[PDB]
Amino acid sequence: QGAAQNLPADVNQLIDQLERHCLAPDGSLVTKSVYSDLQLAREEMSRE
Amino acid sequence: KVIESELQGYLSATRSRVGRCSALIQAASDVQEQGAVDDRDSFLHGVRDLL
Numbered sequence: 292q293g294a295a296q297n298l299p300a301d302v303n304q305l306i307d308q309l310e311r312h313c314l315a316p317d318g319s320l321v322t323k324s325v326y327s328d329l330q331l332a333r334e335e336m337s338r339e
Numbered sequence: 340k341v342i343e344s345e346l347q348g349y350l351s352a353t354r355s356r357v358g359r360c361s362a363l364i365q366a367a368s369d370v371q372e373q374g375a376v377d378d379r380d381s382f383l384h385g386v387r388d389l390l
Contacts, residue, residue, distance in 0.1 A: 303390070319385070321381075322381055322382045322384055322385030322388070323382075323385045
């Protein structure tokens with residue numbers, strides 16, 4: 292029963308830690324490109 | 340002879356339609372593309388993609 296309680300957390304942690312290293316690949320940048328684009332809005336505000 | 344002088348002025352008249360033809364399309368893009376602008380509202384998926 293106890294191991295079943297951790298399973299939703301266990302299945303999360305399998306890829307959760309690697310998704311920081313998965314952030315740079317396209318598995319995240321299809322939305323998370325803003326981080327690789329450094330605030331994809333306009334790189335914060337300078338002139339735009 | 341004024342017509343030929345004004346034909347160059349008329350040349351601006353006819354080509355202005357081409358300028359209208361080459362510009363009016365952008366106006367309809369804001370309304371016709373609303374089904375393809377779902378990219379950064381799926382960026383909102385990323386922030387809520389935590390789980």
